Amino acid sequence: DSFIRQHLRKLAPYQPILPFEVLSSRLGRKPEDIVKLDANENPYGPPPEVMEALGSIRFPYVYPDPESRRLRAALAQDSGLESEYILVGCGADELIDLIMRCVLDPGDKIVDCPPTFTMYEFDAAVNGALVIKVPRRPDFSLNVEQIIEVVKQEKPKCIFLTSPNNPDGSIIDDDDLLKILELPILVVLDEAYIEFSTIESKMSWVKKHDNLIVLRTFSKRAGLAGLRVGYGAFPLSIIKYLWRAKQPYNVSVAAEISACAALQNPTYLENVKDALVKERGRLFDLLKAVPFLKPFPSHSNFILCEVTSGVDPKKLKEDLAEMGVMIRHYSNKELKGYVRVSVGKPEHTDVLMNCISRL
């Protein structure tokens, strides 16, 4: 019969997403004319050094460095954590999956704290693991007491935790993280959006906690989502094995070159971050005034809104799409009641609010 592993034959069907190019064609506008606020992308783009570097790639025909050592050296200088603790992935997505592939045998358990990033549950399913859900509270904070009780009874192997969280943007306090780190469990802290907050990265904590991994990305603040480059800090006892199991060449030459070039312009990275943080506050106030939207406070580059007053979130997202504005709506049953608006340029917010007014 089928060659496909049984657990994968039970996966959810594929969900094709409307590319913003097709929508632009459908609406009769250029792709650049779409206001795209649905994927937490940085509309300012990366520092100018990036496209200059990508246009002058010397060795596109040669395999990349399997150790990504130039970027790791730049990240060690940037972070203050030695390169021996740092892995580079094809996005942070590769590192999430690599951790699960290297830690979870089929039937092993992980804890997830929804509502959160859908890739943790997806990767768990693909890897044959079981997810134990410990939901966050209505303010999106972790229920540490429930996490502790569940971990002690079920003895899961890992827990993935996003901070600032996707999709609401709240942060995990140091106290809560330390309490969870006392448990005999591998804690993966996803700091994808940390640069939009005033909280310091916990990369260096991996030297004191052999059950902590910290993940980061270039896809958001650094504006390189297309090029596929992320990284993480790992205890030495873990990274030795991840190096041996990692695919040799998933980090492309374009990925390594672009990330290195981005790090050469710290002023740009800081300035675009500050522009997005400033616009986050303005957008939050504007969304709060909409009678049928309840925005939540955020430390990221996006704002989650509960849709109230009997308004249909899916119809809202679709109506805005007809006007050339893309926001995030969810099919996951936990988040169907919300929409998420990414922070863009001030003119993007203005277009959004003008469209909301018409609706």
Contact range with Na ion by CB under 5 A, out of 222-230, 252-260, 282-290, 321-329: 282-290
Smallest distance, a second copy to C-beta of residue 202, A: 18
Long-range contacts, stretch 348-353, CB < 8 angstroms, 24+ apart: 348/35, 348/37, 348/43, 349/279, 349/282, 349/283, 349/286, 351/35, 351/324, 351/325, 352/35, 352/37, 352/320, 352/325, 352/327, 353/286
Paired with 327 in beta bridges are 37
Query: What is the DSSP annotation of 294-318?
Result: EE---SSSEEEEEE-TT--HHHHHH
Question: What part of residues 290-319 is at the interface with Na ion (CB under 5 A)?
Answer: 293
Q: How is residue 103 written in tokens? A: 């830690």
- Reduced to 3 states, what is the DSSP secondary structure of residue 331? coil
State the binding string over 20-49 for a second copy (x if CB under 8 A, else -).
xxx--------xx---x--x-xxxxxx---
* 249 contact, one of a second copy, Na ion, none, CB 5-8 Å limit per kind: a second copy
**Radius of gyration (Cα) for the chain, nearest Å?**
21
DSSP structure class, residue 55:
T
State the binding string over 171-210 for a second copy (x if CB under 8 A, else -).
---------------x------------------------
Contact range with Na ion by CB under 5 A, out of 108-116, 122-130, 149-157, 280-288: 280-288
Contact range with a second copy by CB under 8 A, out of 65-73, 167-175, 195-203, 331-339: 65-73
Yes or no: say if 241 and 102 are a contact pair by the CB < 8 Å rule: yes
Q: Which of 83, 204, 250, 265 binds a second copy (CB under 8 A)?
A: 250
* 39 contact, one of Na ion, a second copy, none, CB 5-8 Å limit per kind: a second copy
For the beta sheet containing 109-112, the strands, ordered from the edge strand earlier in sequence to the opposite edge, are 86-89, 230-233, 212-217, 186-190, 158-162, 109-112, 130-133
Question: What part of residues 209-248 is at the interface with a second copy (CB under 8 A)?
Answer: 211, 219, 223-228, 237-238, 240-241, 243-245, 247-248
Query: What is the DSSP annotation of 336-347?
Result: TTEEEEE---HH
Question: What part of residues 71-90 is at the interface with a second copy (CB under 8 A)?
Answer: 90
Q: Which of 11, 178, 236, 359 binds a second copy (CB under 8 A)?
A: 11
State the binding string over 238-277 for Na ion (x if CB under 5 A, else -).
----------------------------------------
Contact range with Na ion by CB under 5 A, out of 227-235, 239-247, 287-295, 309-317: 287-295
**What interhelical angle do 174-181 and 144-154 show, nearest 10?**
10
Smallest distance, a second copy to C-beta of residue 354, A: 23
